[PDB]
Amino acid sequence: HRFHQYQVVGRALPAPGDEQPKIYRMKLWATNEVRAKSKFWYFLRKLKKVKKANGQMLAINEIFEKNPTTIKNYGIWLRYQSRTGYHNMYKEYRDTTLNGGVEQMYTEMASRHRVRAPCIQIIKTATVDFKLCKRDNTKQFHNSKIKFPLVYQKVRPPTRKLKTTYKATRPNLFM
RNA sequence: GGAUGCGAUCAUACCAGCACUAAGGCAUCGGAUCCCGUCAGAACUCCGAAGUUAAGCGUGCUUGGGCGAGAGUAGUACAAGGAUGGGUGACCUCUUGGGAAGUCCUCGUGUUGCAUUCC
Numbered sequence A: 001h002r003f004h005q006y007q008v009v010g011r012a013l014p015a016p017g018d019e020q021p022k023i024y025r026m027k028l029w030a031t032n033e034v035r036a037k038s039k040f041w042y043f044l045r046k047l048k049k050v051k052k053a054n055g056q057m058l059a060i061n062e063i064f065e066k067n068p069t070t071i072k073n074y075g076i077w078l079r080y081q082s083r084t085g086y087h088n089m090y091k092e093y094r095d096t097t098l099n100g101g102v103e104q105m106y107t108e109m110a111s112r113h114r115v116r117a118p119c120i121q122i123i124k125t126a127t128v129d130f131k132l133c134k135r136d137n138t139k140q141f142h143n144s145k146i147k148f149p150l151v152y153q154k155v156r157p158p159t160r161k162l163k164t165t166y167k168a169t170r171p172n173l174f175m
Numbered sequence B: 001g002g003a004u005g006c007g008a009u010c011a012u013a014c015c016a017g018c019a020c021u022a023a024g025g026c027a028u029c030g031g032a033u034c035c036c037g038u039c040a041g042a043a044c045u046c047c048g049a050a051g052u053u054a055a056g057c058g059u060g061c062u063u064g065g066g067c068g069a070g071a072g073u074a075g076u077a078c079a080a081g082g083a084u085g086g087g088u089g090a091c092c093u094c095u096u097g098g099g100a101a102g103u104c105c106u107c108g109u110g111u112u113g114c115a116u117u118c119c
């Protein structure tokens, strides 16, 4: 998986003023742990008033998909920066893991809106029952009798050893 | 709980308006020979001790002004380093660091040395 979910826990440095400071937790999506802790300290500085130099890092744990063999419907609420302004949007995805949905979200924002990873803030992630899905192209795959042909086959050899520059006849492909 | 003399800090001590104070000390106060002094014994100077706490000085009060400390403003504004970062540009993102100031709100309104002295 490209993206991992982590639970990061930290607090302000214990000082004689408090000596038992409040504990803060976040669920962040990053490619490894070092990038997860940096993004945590980014949000703690901007949302609370605790930055890394005044704070303590307590724990960091990776969250995993409970059932990576079923298909879930995944809603994502995000904040992104465009060329002119800030906007929030809701996106829906179908995947066996929420990791795949987050990778799907980042890829889609890059294509449809030319938005890079730094300019995106995941507000909220959740699993949505198929009865409550909102976006089209997610409901149409809720058909229990779903049937269709494969309209693009990608004719190719299997293991690159069987590749030849020339062939004696044109390929026959059908669907 | 007070004062006086000489101070330290130099508004938490200043300013404005009100109220009150035992003893003592300060002070107001009486006078113009002498020293001194002016248009003027008002001031300054000299000599006193009839009266008074009215003023001054001291203490307290005010949803007071100011001053001082907090909280908040706000991880905002700004700004050190990095990017073959975005954008036509103006500018703006992210990354490794630093980080303010009015309004608004809360609280406070001194501390203290040496000598002598009053309860």
Ligand SMILES: [Mg+2]
Binding pocket: none
């Ligand atoms: Mg006279």
Ligand SMILES: [Mg+2]
Binding pocket: B053
């Ligand atoms: Mg009086």
Ligand SMILES: [Mg+2]
Binding pocket: none
């Ligand atoms: Mg005041």
